[PDB]
Every structure is written in structure tokens, then in C-alpha cells.
Amino acid sequence: TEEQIAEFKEAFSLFDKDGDGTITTKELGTVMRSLGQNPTEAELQDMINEVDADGNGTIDFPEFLTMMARKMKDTDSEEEIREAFRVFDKDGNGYISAAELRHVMTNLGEKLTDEEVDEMIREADIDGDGQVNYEEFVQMMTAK
Amino acid sequence: TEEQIAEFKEAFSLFDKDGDGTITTKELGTVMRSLGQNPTEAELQDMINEVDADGNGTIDFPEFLTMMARKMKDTDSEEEIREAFRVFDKDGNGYISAAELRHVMTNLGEKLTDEEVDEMIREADIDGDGQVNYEEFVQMMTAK
Amino acid sequence: TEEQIAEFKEAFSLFDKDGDGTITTKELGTVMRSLGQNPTEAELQDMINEVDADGNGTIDFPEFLTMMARKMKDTDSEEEIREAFRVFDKDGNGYISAAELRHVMTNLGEKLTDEEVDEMIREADIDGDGQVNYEEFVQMMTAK
Amino acid sequence: TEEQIAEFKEAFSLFDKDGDGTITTKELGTVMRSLGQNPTEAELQDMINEVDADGNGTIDFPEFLTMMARKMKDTDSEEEIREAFRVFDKDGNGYISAAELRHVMTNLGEKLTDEEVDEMIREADIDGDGQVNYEEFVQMMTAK
Amino acid sequence: THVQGRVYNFLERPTGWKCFVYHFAVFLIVLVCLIFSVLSTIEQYAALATGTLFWMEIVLVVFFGTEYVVRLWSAGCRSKYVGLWGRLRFARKPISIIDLIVVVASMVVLCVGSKATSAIRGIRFLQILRMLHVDRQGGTWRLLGSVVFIHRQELITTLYIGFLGLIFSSYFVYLAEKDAVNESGRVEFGSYADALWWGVVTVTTIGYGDKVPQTWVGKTIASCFSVFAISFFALPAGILGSGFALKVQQKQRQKHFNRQIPAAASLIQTAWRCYAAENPDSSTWKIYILREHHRATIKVIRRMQYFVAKKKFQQARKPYDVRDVIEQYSQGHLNLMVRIKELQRRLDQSIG
Amino acid sequence: THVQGRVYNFLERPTGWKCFVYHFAVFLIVLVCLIFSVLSTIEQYAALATGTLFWMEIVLVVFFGTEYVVRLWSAGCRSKYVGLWGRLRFARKPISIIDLIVVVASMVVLCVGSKATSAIRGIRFLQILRMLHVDRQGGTWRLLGSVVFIHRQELITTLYIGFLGLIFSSYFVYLAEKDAVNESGRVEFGSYADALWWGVVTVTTIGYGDKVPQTWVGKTIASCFSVFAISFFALPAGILGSGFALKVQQKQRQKHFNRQIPAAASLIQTAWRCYAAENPDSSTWKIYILREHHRATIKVIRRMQYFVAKKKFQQARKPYDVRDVIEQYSQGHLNLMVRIKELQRRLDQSIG
Amino acid sequence: THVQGRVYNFLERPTGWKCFVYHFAVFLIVLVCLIFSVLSTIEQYAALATGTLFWMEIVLVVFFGTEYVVRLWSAGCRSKYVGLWGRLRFARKPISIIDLIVVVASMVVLCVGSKATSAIRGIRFLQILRMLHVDRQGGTWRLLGSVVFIHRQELITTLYIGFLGLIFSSYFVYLAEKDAVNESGRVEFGSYADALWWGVVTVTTIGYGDKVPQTWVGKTIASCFSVFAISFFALPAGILGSGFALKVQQKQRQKHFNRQIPAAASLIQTAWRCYAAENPDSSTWKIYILREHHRATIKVIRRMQYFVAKKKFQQARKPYDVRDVIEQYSQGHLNLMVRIKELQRRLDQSIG
Amino acid sequence: THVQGRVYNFLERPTGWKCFVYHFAVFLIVLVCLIFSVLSTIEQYAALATGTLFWMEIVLVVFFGTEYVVRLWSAGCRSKYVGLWGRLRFARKPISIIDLIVVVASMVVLCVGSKATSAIRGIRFLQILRMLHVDRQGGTWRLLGSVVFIHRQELITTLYIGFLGLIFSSYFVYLAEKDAVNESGRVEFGSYADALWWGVVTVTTIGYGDKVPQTWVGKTIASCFSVFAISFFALPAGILGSGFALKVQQKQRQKHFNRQIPAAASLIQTAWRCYAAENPDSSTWKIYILREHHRATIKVIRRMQYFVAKKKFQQARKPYDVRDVIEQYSQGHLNLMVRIKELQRRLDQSIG
Ligand SMILES: [Ca+2]
Ligand SMILES: [Ca+2]
Ligand SMILES: [Ca+2]
Ligand SMILES: [Ca+2]
Ligand SMILES: [Ca+2]
Ligand SMILES: [Ca+2]
Ligand SMILES: [Ca+2]
């Protein structure tokens, strides 16, 4: 795992920039604004709380490694994504309309951009039927 | 109900005035002040919360249609109005004094104007005996 | 009880001054500062809450009458005062030392003045024993 | 004994410097800053709350005596320190690594100084094995 | 004027000590009648009790008829029971129906049977039926019914699974014990009906002992079934008892009755304003003082206010909960933020 | 001065291990006397137990007589029991009455019986009554009574409905089994009293088996009644157990005893200030430093403060709840808003 | 296709009153078949019930065979059951397996038995197996299983300790009663198997009475064991009932279904953005509009946002709790502090 | 180095699936031995089971003797069990004592009894005792004991009142039924011991039926006693079940294990700083950067900080409650007020 530890350390150093060994809310927000996201202080605190295990308010390298060591291909993650998709499933038959999916994606939550919403619809297209199947969507999302 | 949808869309456009497709607390308060109500921000948030279903903080046209599609002639609504009336029923015999009703209406809650309180008393008049029967009042109010 | 309603109305008018028919926190605090007590807003709200029944935030004449119609000679009130006295009862035999009672009275709660504390001790003196009986104290306090 | 009362009174006078007979958050913070600790108001309130029994917000001499009359050699205190040590015990065999102990001590909680951390490690050294036994540490800590 | 209400509060909704004494005396004399009916079935006490029964039943039928008439007259104090249709609305209630049936059948029995087995069977059943007269308001029945309805899914689940276990275990024990003969030469399990009777008696933890499995297979099946399926029949009592305790505990965190006065007044006012908005020439239109298009907006704002008032009245009638804390914090935080924003706006206006 | 209090704490409110050992020894000797009473009924052990009973009863009556006198003297440590009327107040308590009865009847029995059937029945019942002596403070009785009183409506509902079900099912089974004859030629259900006995034994899940329905109608009615009405008699145990568990859980969220010291001091001070306002020449009137008409206002403000102090003392003695959170947030929000208004007013006065 | 979905909602997820009536009628016909099966064992009703059984079973096997095929065709409305593999995935459910077994064994019985004891035993067991057909969704089984799994440690503890007490008490009573002979000359406790049978019957509070200890040692051991170890076998019912009541009470503090719409949308969006970050030429990279090293940072920030979205979706589906209050206060206090810091910074920048 | 830890985790604190399979196999073999012990008492199976018992007991005694030695060696992985005194401290545990007894008595039996009735009774009891070997950590016993200790007052109250009711009702029924003779000419209630046996069997809802009251007075007393005093014996199961459910519900509101890391570190640091303050030449005195009279103040401030750390560690290990909300609001309100005071002070200093 030489390459994995090397790239994780490089990513950690791209956030730290101080040599302290801990990533704080200020540093995370600084990098996010460098990317151009002007995140809220509450958002940054929520981002920090997940990675931070000890509870001191920062992120150490063991915490960074633990958070990078997770996987979205997990069965629980797949079930969670399916359950999130079932909120917009009206009939309950495992199908969601393309128009309703596009509206929800563009107008709720993170408010995805139109181009990436069309990219998702292209990926989640059952031969262009118009009533997309959201099970194969989660299948290829978690396939990685 | 195409005419009903047309009138509902007209009312929604009158509330919106922006063409965005959503009604916010700012727009609702603007219209209310245009009518001369100077409502509180907490009041506006409470008004928005009932109509807003998705939880995004605004009112879409489906939410406006759902809210306009409700009814006050419902049996549960009638029972709720009766239960509200029972709070001022001292005995429990279904009668409330005209003077007590007038005092409550003018001095509590929304603080109805004297003229509309007399209008209500005229509508709910049991031959001018002075002990109004509040069940007939709910009967006529829910009859619409 | 024509005389009783008479002096109750006189006291209510003395508290009101405005003639509206209600007593607010501002008016209560104004009178209290006229007496020289500069009460806190929280204290005034607590004082208003007990008397105010309807919940409108003020005190009407029926509420004033209801509050004035209570009694401290009640059995529940006597038991409450006894239970309050038992907090400072060490042995549990119904006796509290005069020195401990004086210290508690002068240094805790309302912080009674030394002169009225000596007046209380003179009233609650079982032949000058020095270990006052707090049951006869409550007995003659509730006698009124 | 009389010597204990005399020294406790001397300490109370050093904390008070006022002759009132009570120690407040302001006085405690003043002494702490005289030592050079710049404590927070929340920290001072937390310090006062433990010692203050009656609940008036200050510390009387009986409360000071009660607080000084405690001891860390208590069995419950020893069990509490052991339970605190078990949080950093990975295997559960009663041993904690010297490096992990040093890191936790320097980087968590009160953030002990390096010199006193080395002093602790010298005290808690089982013939320099490198995997210190935290049971004998608590044993000699609670010995005095 | 008030005499009708006073006698109605005496009879239908007793409160005080005089009404309690009256109702307790009625309960005692009804219980004495039931005890006499029980004694009438014994051989030695058959003649004495029956001889005493006639006068006691005549006195009771006259007293209960007079009290029924008085109660029906006094029902007009309320507003639902005013008039002829109100009286037949009062008579339609189940308790009034039972009261009428018990009296009319009592007179019929005393007028036909008096001048054999049925003539005393009917009177015994009628004095058994008189114990329902105690609960005038149906409070016990409503209290049981609310908790039963709330836990209906759990009750149905437990009953269904217990019934399945009973049926299957009874069949298996019947197969194991079909041909077995106990002492005294009697086949206890001669059919699946006998197996079902044994299963009911065993699963309800009664255990009469008239049917006991006697083979080792039957005893093993009975042991497992008794260990497991008995809890499925003891479950409803635990569910209902815990529910009752939870409601009693929730009764200690109820809001004061005076906290819903403003909410009820506001609900009535908002509902009436929504109603009066429907009148083009109403006097409720001068609150906002040519009004042509503002009416369509006002009729929507009033409906929204009515919905808010409904929410507030619903919340005012519930006990305290975490939702109350969350709503209170939301409102307080919004007000504080508005105040600090006003501070900023004033400062920028004044000093720039 | 403190000897009376020390012996009172030894006897009536034991604490430590010596008092516990003393009370345990008393309980063991009373239990041994009860076991000897049980053994006196057996034929072989009748003579030996009765012969041993005389000396044991003499020793116990002397010990309890001495200890009763010691306790009655020591009761004067308290304030309610000082003096002659205090001693007769102590003797009036139910536990002291039982203690006096057990001793006086013991001396009477030992002086009359020694110098037949009743002479032994009485002393057996007297040593049965000595088990009540264990609970000196009545803690178990009060703990049961509080929970029983709190859940009284549910208990009454369950008992009433179960009684109705028992009565009706017993009557129906009696009708179904009136003429049936079982094996050995005996009519198990010969009367409604027999049906009621069967119903009680069945609905309490005892099931002796001396009376069992033998017809198919009776068995079906018994099956339905056993399935349903048994839960109505098992309910009170569940209600009371869940209540006990809920109180025990509530004990873990109780406020510290020191949180009510300021509240109790404030209640005493406010009550005494209200009391002392009644004296025109009192020294409590100099707090407001002539004074002619301010008395009517002061006597009202003092009453309001007394009511507030009563509320605070009531709240200080309760466990934590959602009401505490709501009140704390209300006070904090009010204080913060007042502070921001002070900021605004100061800034406007200074620069505006 | 909407007809397929409509018939699927009619059959597998009924809602309304027509579907309830249909399912209730099916339940009644199955119950009537079970009653006929019970009556077939009785001697007098053996011939008539069996003669009625043939046509009833023919009608039921045809109806259930048609309905199984209709249901399996209608399963294609869902997405998991589309196609051949979807149909055989439907067929692997336990309820569908039971439905197929009941029908195929019915046809086998009608084709083989028609051409003994087995030929009627099979059909009798098959009409017992038809009562599982009522619960199509398995709701009762899932509701029981969730609560059983949650309290599994307590259930295992109670069962283990009760089993230990049963074993030890049975052995001790066997030792005490090994050689005793009761009336009628029969050794009730002839072996440890007999002692175990007595122990099971006693500890389950059944008490048939066919085995009762007859020595004083055995009676004392039985008394202590009955007093203590019976509660260990009554415990599971109390645990499960209190659990059921607690879940029912928790159902009243559930958040509205519309409150999780933004959280679900955010979870889907964050998961898809994490997925699309894996494509170097994706169109999700223009949100940040040259970009060479920012990819490693973006792929970490997106993962953190995905974890936050997962937490929010988890919290949105839970009932209200103290954690919600704590989180809300934390966010509000942070926002207020940030606003006051902004006020300070603005003032210092503007005026110095 | 780590092999001792791996084998200790395999034996004393199993986790995974291999250890579970091993322990399950041991449980099955012990259960098979118990079943063979049961079969050894039966006449036909006496020879075969006893003949098979010898080899199985030899195999088990060798296996358990080897495993005990392996476990005792492996105990040295922990710190409390290092060395000779650590090993004999391990041997003093009740479970290790039972394990040693089961093996040593097995060898003693195989060496003495093999070379009688006792020689089989002892081994039967020993392989009854082997079921305690399943619970290595005593988790079930501790789980029961904690809940029993928490509800001890309620359990004692219910047991005491039920015992009093049993004693008094048994005496009254004995008086009512002393001279009665049932069918077959046998006095069921011949003494107070017989009355007590009847009372225990009735109040525990077993109801064998060997003693039933036969007079009307006895039946009435039994009816009242069965209705009332039975709930007092069914109460402990309800109390304990509701307690278990309440703990299980409280398990869902527990704080994360990582939340107490800062609190534990702070507690250790504060305790060690209090300890090191006792050394005049310690290096903990340079935290304040001569120092002669400040030592008395420092040693008090450190003790106060240690007490605060103890409180924080106690609070960090508890589930969420209203106290957490109250403390959080208090701290947040204090911080906000301090910040607004800083705002006011800055404004007044800058502008006046
Ligand atoms: Ca920083
Ligand atoms: Ca960290
Ligand atoms: Ca808009
Ligand atoms: Ca929208
Ligand atoms: Ca009025
Ligand atoms: Ca004014
Ligand atoms: Ca103080």
C-alpha cells in the first residue's frame, strides 16, 4: 500500500498547508473557496464532524485514512440510495419518470446543473423509454 | 375543473409577480403589506410552512393547488370548530352567551372588529334571546 | 361582598392608571419602581404569568378577582410551607436552630432585612429556647 | 484538626481578599489570571458549580471545607480513573503503549506539557518495556 | 331555567357527593338483586329468594321507569336533545336503549310470567343486564376502546400467530395421541375437536387436567408448545397494560386548559373570516381599508391563516413533546436573527 | 438531649448495619414463631410445638412490651409527639395500634388460656399478626398505594369489564351445562353459584378441574371466554408493573436536593412577608423607604411574589421534563432580547 | 401498463374496501374448510363432512390455481419481477412457495387418493396450511421479528436462567419423590423424565395435576421453585408487550414524510456527484469553472459531502429525540455567534 | 507475544464465527450428556445409557481438563492475571471454581465409584452442573442482577404484601375447611401446612386440584384471594419486563464511544496534575512560568478542575437526556451574553 499511503498523504498535505498535522474548519473552507464554493460555517462544521472521530474539532491523518478507507459499493450504501430513490417513487414499482427525476434533481437538494442532469439521464436510460428504472441506476453507480 | 385551474394559476401569478414559479416569504409579505397587514416574519414563515410540502421553503404550483383543493366543510373541520367553541362553553349544553362570545371575539386571538362581530351575532341569532346556540353557527359556517 | 368588589376595583384602578382595563408588565414594573424595587423583566413576566389565566399576556379584572380570592390559610399552603421548612431541618424532628434560620433568611432567597428577621425570630420564639419549632411558626402564620 | 481548619481558612482568605465570606466567579478568575491561566467564563462557572452546594452562585466557607475534605484515594475515584484509561486500551489486557499514551496526553484534553508527560512516563515505566501497565499507574496515583 | 340542567348534572354526569351516594346506592341494590337471583338457583333458597324477588322487582321496575322518564325529560337542557327529534336522539343511544329494554321486559315478565323455566330465565338475564346501568357515560368502555384501537396491529399480530400455533400444535398432539388410552380406559384425544379443546386449555395456562398427553412424543410436543405459544396468548395483557401506564404517564405532561383559549378564539375567528369572505358585500372587507383584484388574494391569505390557526389549536391540545421545543427554538432563533439584522440595517442607515 | 433522638433513630427510622441486624433478628424470631404455629396444627408435632409455644410467647410478650414502652418514651424527640397529647398521637397510628393489640391480647391469652379451641386459635392468629411489625414506616404500603391511586381509573375499568364478562359467561355456561352429568354421576353445574365458581377459577387461570364444561356449546363458550376475558384479569398486574418501572426510570432524572434550597428559602420569606404585611406597625414596611395609599399596592405585589415563589418551589421538587427546557428557553430568549434592546437604546442615545 | 399494476395492488398490496372484502371472504371460506376438517374426525360427522370435502376442495383448488397464475402474471408490474428470471424470483418467496405447495399437493391428493389414513391426513394438513395464505405481505411476521430481534439478549437471558432453574428443581424434586407412592398405587415420579414433565407443567403455570409432589421436602422445593422460577417464564411476554407499547408510543413522534424529500434528493445528488467524479472527461467538472491538481481535493470534498448527506438522510427518517434538539441548538448558536462576529468585524472595519 | 492474546480471545471472550461454532458444539455435547442422564433413569434405557456414559464422561473429562489448563495459561495475556498470584486470582472466579469442581469430581467419581447408587447420582448431578459452563463471562447473570437491583424496593414490596396475603388467606381457608370431608373420604385441609400448600398453588395460578375448598365460606374466601392476591405474585414479571424494555429503549439514545475520548483524556490529565502537585520539585510547576504562596491556591484550583473533569467524564458516558439540553442551553446563553457584553464594552471604549 505504498501508493495508497503516498496519495493519501499528498491529499492530506493539499488540505493542511501548515505542517501542523490537523485539518481545521478554516483550512477546509479556505480550500473550498479556492475551488470557488464559499461554503457556510455550519456546512464546514458538518463536513468536519464526520471525519473527526476523537472529537477535538480537527482531522488527523488516522482520521483522514479512516474516512478515505470507506466504500460506496457497500450493501448498506446501496440500500440507502435505493431508499432515497423510493421517496420519489409514486407507484412503488421501481420506476420513476424521467421528467420527475429531472425536476427533483435540478430543483431540490444540491440543485444539480442541467448538463450533469442530462448526463445522468443518458446514463440512466432504459432504451429511452421515458420511465427510467432507478434500480439499474443504483447498480451501475455502486458498481464503480 | 379547467376553469378552476385557470383561476388558481391567476392567483398564483398574482402572488408570484416574478415568473420564477415559487412564492417566498418576501413575496407573501410584500403582498400582505400591499393589503395593509404588516405581518411578522414568524407569521409569514408559519403561513409558508403549511402550504409548503416538499420543504424547500417556498410554494410551487402543485403545492398551491393542493392547498386550494382543501375544504372547510369537512367533518373533521366541523368537529374542530365545535371543540374550539367548547372552550368557552361553561356548562356543556351547547350554548354560549352572546356577551361572552362578543367579548372573546373582540378581545382574544385575531381581535375581530366590532362591526364584523355584530354581523356574526346577527347571523347567529336565536330569535334575539341572548344565548346563542353555537352548533347552528358551525352548521351554517360549514355549509358555505 | 359589595365592599370586597369595591376595594378590589380600587386596587385594580391603582395598578392600571391607563383605564384600558388590563395590567401589563410595563404598568406593573412602573408601579414597582414607584415603590423602589427596579424589578427585572423576567421577574415581571413571572409575576404576570401566575395571575394571567386567558394567556393574552395581561391581567383583566376577572383574573385580578380570581387571584385576590385565594388564601394562604389553605391546608395545601400549610403543607407547602412545612415542606419548605423541612429542607433546612437536619435531624427531622421539627426543630430548626435560631442561628441557622437567621443565616438562611438573611443570606438566601429574598434576603430578608435583619430587622424583619429579628421580628420573625421574636414571633417564632418558644420561650427563648434557641432551637425554634417551625411548626408553631407555620401555624400562627397561617392563622392570619 | 485545628491545623487543617487554619490552613483551609488561609486558602479561603487568599481566594476571597474581600472579607465578604463568599468566592465568586470574578474573584476566582482574578486569582487564576494572577497565576496566568486566562480562564473562560464558562470554565469559571463550571468550577464554581461543583463547589457551590446551596446554589446561590458563590462559595461559602462550609462549601469550601466540604470540597477540601474530599480525597482522590477513594475506590470510586480509582475505578473512574481506570475506566478513563480503558478508553485508550485497544486490546483490553490492561496495557497501553507508551507512544499512544504520550500522544494522547500531549494532544488531547488539557494538553499536558512535554516535560510533565516525560515525568509521567518515567513514573509509569515497567522497567522501560515500552508497553506501560496503566493499573500500577493508577495504583500509585491513588496511593497519595 | 336551571332546574333542568341541575337534574341533568345529577343524573347523567354525576359530580359531588350526593350524586355519588345515589349512584352507589343504586349499584348496591342492583348487586343485592343479582345475589338474590344467584340464590334462587339453589334448591333450599329457591322458594325464599323467588318469593322475595317479586316485590323487589316491582319496586325496581317502578323506580327505574320513573327515573328513565325524569332523565329523558331532563335531557332537553343540552342543545342536541331539544325537541322531539332530540328526545328520540337521546333514546337512540345504546345506554338508553338498554335502559328501555330492561324496563319494558321487566314489565312484560311481571305481567305475563307472574299470571315456567323461561319466566325465571328471562328475569335472571334481565337482572344480569342491570349491571350495565352503572356506567352512564361509557367512560370505561371508551377508555378500553381507545387503547385497543391504538395497539390494534400488535393485538392482531399476537392473536393470529397464537391461533396458528394453537392449530398446528393441536393437530400434532392429536396425531401423537390418537389411539392412546389412559387409566380407567378412556381415549382423551378421540378427535381434533378434543385436541383443540386441550390446546385452548393448555395455551391459556388453565390446565384443567381432563386431557393430558400420555405418550413421550405428545409430551415433548406439549412441552415445546407450552413453553412458546403461551407467551403469545399472555402478550395482549402486557401490551394493553404498558399502553395504559404510558397514557397515565403522559397525563402528567399535559398543557393547562387556559393555554388553548387564545388558540380556540383564533381558530373560530379565522374560520368565520374565511366564511365571511364569501360575501361580496360583507363588512369584513373594510379591515384592509376600489377593491377588484385584491379579493382573490385576500381569500387565499385568509385560507392560509385558517390553516395556521388549525395547526396552533391542534398543538395546544397535546401534551409537551420534543416538537414543542424544536418549534420554540426555531421561532426564537428567527426572531433573534431578525433583531440583529435590524441592528445592522439601522447602523448602515445612520453611519453608512 | 440527643439520647432520645438516637434511640428513636435506632427504633423507628433505622439506618446503618446494627439497626438492620436488630430488625433482621426480630423478623427471624417472628418467622420462627410462625413456623412453630404451623407445626402446632400437625398431629405429631402438636404437643411439642404447643409446649414450646408457651415460653416463646412469654419471652416475646415481655420483649415487645419493653420495646413498646421504650419507643413511646423515645417518640418525644420529634415535635409532633412532645407531651401527653403527642404520646396519644403516637399511639393513635395504625402500626402502634397493631403493636398494642398484639401485646395486650398476648397477655390476655397467656393469663386466661393457661389459667380450648379458641385459646389456641387466638394465639395462632396473634403470631400471624406479628408479621405486620416488620414495616415500621409503612414504606411498602405507601409505595403500593401511590401507584394504585394513580392508575385507579384503569384498574376500575379493567375490574368492571372483567366482572361483567365473568358474570355473563358464567350464566351462559350454566345454561349450557345445567342438566349435564359427567362420569361418576355428579352434576358439576347444579346452580349459578357453581357456574360462578367455575368462572372465577377459569378466569383467574387457576383451573382446579373440579368443574369442567362437558357439552360442545359449553366448551365453545368456555373457549371464547378463556381466550378473551382472561386478559382482563391479567391486566392489573401489567398496569402496575409498568407503572412501577416508569417511576423507577423517573427516579434517574431527579434534580439535586440542593436545587430547592434557594426556592424553599424564597417561599418561606415570601410567605412571611405576606403574613407581616398585615401589621400596620411592622418593620417590614421600611423596605420601601409617608406611606398612606401604597399599602394596597404592596399587599398585592407581595401576594403575586408569594404565588411565584410557590410555583418555583413546586418546580424545584420535580424531575426534569420538557417544561423545564421550554421555561429555560423562554427566560433566556427574553433576557437576550432585552439585552439587544439595551444595545439599541444606548447606541441611539449616544449617536442619534 | 396500468391494468397489471391495478390487479397487483388488488392482490398483493390491498387497499380500500373491495380488496378487504375479497380477502375476508377468502379467509372465511378457508376457516369453513378448517371447521369441516375438524368435524370430519368426529364419528357421526365423518361421512357428511368428508362427502362435502371433495367438491369444496375441487372448487378451492381451481380458484387458488387460477389466482396463483393471475398473481404471477401481475407480478411483472414491479421492476424486480420483470421477465422470466423475475417470475422465478417471485416464485422463491416463502409465501409463494407455500401457495404452490398447497395447490400442487391438493391436485396430487385429488389424483392419487381418489385412485386410507394418509389419504385423509394429507388433505387435513393441507387445509391447516391454508391459514398462512391470509398474510400476503408478512406484516405480522416482520412486526414480531423486529421486536424479538431487538430484545434478543433479554429473551436469551430469561430463557437460559429459567431452563437452569427448571433442570435443577426437577432434579431435586425427583430425588425427594423418587420412591413415593400416592393414592391408587402409582409412582408419579418414576424417573427424571417424569420430574422434567412435572417441572415444565408447573413452571408454565398450567398445573394439570397428574403429577404432584407428596412429601414435605418435595412440597417445600416445589413451593420455592413455583414462587421464583415462574416469573422467569412469564418474563418474555412482559418484555415483548412493553416493547410493542414503546414502539407504538414512538410512532406518535415520527417526522412527516415530506420532511425527507430534500434529504433524499441531496443524498442522490451527492452519491451521483461522487460517482461522476471518477470520469476525467465528465461534465460535472465545470461546476468549479487549467484544473490539474484540484481533482484530488475535489474527490475528497465530494466524499465528505456524501457522508454528510448520508447522515442527514438517516436523521430525517427517525422520530424526534433529544439529539435533534441538541443539533438544532448547536447550529443556531453557531449561526448567532457568526452573525455577531460579522457585526463586530463590520463595526471595526467601518469606524476602527 | 500475541498468541496468548489470540487464544484468550478464542476461549474467554469469543468473537467471530469460529469461536461461536466451538462454543455451540460444546453446548450440544453437554446437552447430549444431559439427555443421556435423563434416559439413564428409565428402566429400558438404564443399561444402554449408563454403558454409553462411561466413555463419553472419560472423553469429556480429558477434554475439559486440557481446556482448563490451556485457559489458565492463556490468562496471562491480561495484566490482572500475570504471574503466580495472578493465576490463583483467576482461579478464584466462580466460573473457574465451577469448571475445576466439575473436572475434579469427575476424576474422583471415575476413580472411586467405578472401583453404586451414589456413583451414578453424583455423575448425574455433575453433568447437570455442566450447563453453567456455557456462560463464560456471566453476561446473563449480570444483566439480570442489574435490573433486579434497580427495582429492589418494588420487588420487596410486592413479595412482602403477597406473602402477607397468602398467609392470612391460607389461615382463613384453613378455619373454613378444617372439618370438611370431600368425596372418597379424605380431609384435604388437615392442617395449616395443607392450607399453606393450597395457598401457594392457588396464588401462583398453578392449581393442581389436589386441594380445593368445598364449603361456601371457603369458596368465597378463595374467590376473593384468587382475584386479588394473584396480581401481587404476577407483578414481579411485569416490573422486570418493563424494566428490560426501558433499558433496551435507552440503548438507542447512547452517545458514541468516541465522544468520551476528550473527557477521559482530560480526567487522566487532571488527576495526574493533582497527584504531581504534591511534589515540591515537580516539573508541573513551570506551567505558570518565585512561587512560594501561590502553591496553596494552585493545589485548590487543580482540585476544582479535577472535580469538573470527573463530572464531564460521568456525563459523557450517559445516554442523552433533558439535563444535556439544559446544560447546553446554559453554556450557550452564557457565551452569547458574554459576547454581547464584549460588543457593548468595545463600543463604549471606542466611542463613549
Ligand atoms: Ca485556527
Ligand atoms: Ca481529531
Ligand atoms: Ca419567486
Ligand atoms: Ca419546486
Ligand atoms: Ca367578561
Ligand atoms: Ca402608554
Ligand atoms: Ca454562598
Numbering used by the authors:
A (entry chain H), B (entry chain B), C (entry chain D), D (entry chain F): 6 to 149
E (entry chain A), F (entry chain C), G (entry chain G), H (entry chain E): 104 to 218, 223 to 396, 506 to 568
What does the paper behind this entry write?
The KCNQ1 Kv channel, also known as Kv7.1, is the pore-forming subunit of the slow delayed rectifier potassium channel (IKS) that plays an important role in the repolarization phase of cardiac action potentials. Importantly, KCNQ1 and other Kv7 members are regulated both by membrane voltage and the signaling lipid phosphatidylinositol 4,5-bisphosphate (PIP2). The voltage sensors close the channel at hyperpolarizing membrane voltages, while PIP2 is required for the channel to open. The human KCNQ1 channel was purified as a complex with the structurally obligate subunit calmodulin in the presence of Ca2+ and reconstituted into liposomes composed of 90: 5: 5 1-palmitoyl-2-oleoyl-sn-glycero-3-phosphocholine (POPC) to 1-palmitoyl-2- oleoyl-sn-glycero-3-phosphoglycerol (POPG) to cholesterol [wt: wt: wt] with 300 mM KCl.
From the unpolarized dataset, the best up structure (C4-symmetric) had an overall resolution of 2.9 Å. The up map is best defined in the TM domain, with local resolution estimates of ~2.4 to 2.8 Å for much of S1 through S6. Density for individual hydrogen-bonded water molecules is visible in the voltage sensor. Tightly bound phospholipid and sterol molecules are also visible at both the outer and inner leaflets of the membrane. The up structure in lipid bilayers is very similar to the depolarized structure in detergent micelles. The six positive-charged residues in S4 are positioned as such: R6 (R243) lies below the gating charge transfer center. H5 (H240) occupies the gating charge transfer center consisting of F167 from S2 and the negative-charged E170 and D202 from S2 and S3, respectively. R4 (R237) is directly above the gating charge transfer center and interacts with E160 in S2. The pore radius is ~1 Å at S349 in the up structure, which is notably smaller than the radius of a hydrated K+ ion (~4 Å). In other words, when the voltage sensor is up, PIP2 can bind to this pocket and promote channel opening.
